């Protein structure tokens, strides 16, 4: 502090260089990969073992975001998915945060689905507090993933879960979009 500005910048910088691709169901690998890119992710956001903390205050979710979707990351909090925009928000950036729905042994994301348009969730992350309004919700296929693409001009975060409980046959995906405050 200030060396968190210039992990900012450079998460800022991230993101811009982020490149489309396909991105695939966090549940379909349970493995950390293990590529050149991926190490390259690891640097992004790393001062804390934290990368973020998000906060739906009307589902009473308060929990820790970490580099990743593989099996050990989501049991410990919600996992940020390789591919996606950081959570620093901006324009042109779409954030896909991971969650769990019956892990049993914890909460995660099970009640994503009491939310509607309109409720609001924060995305906390070096030293800035983002507010985003939910403005879009939607049950959807494993494999149907369009839609976790970046909305260039957009600053956007979804965040996706299993459903239904205990059967995860689909995804909940809650989109919200950056609100000033
Ligand atoms: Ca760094
Ligand atoms: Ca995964």
Redesign the pocket.
Known sequence: PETIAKERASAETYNNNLESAPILD??????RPDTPQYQAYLHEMDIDPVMARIVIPSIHVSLPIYH????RTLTEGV?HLFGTSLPVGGPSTHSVLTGHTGLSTATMFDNLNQLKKGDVFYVSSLGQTLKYEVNDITVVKPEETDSLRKVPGRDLVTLITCTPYGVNSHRLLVTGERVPM
């Open positions: 966090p549940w379909l690998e349970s493995q990743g979707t593989d099996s996992g």
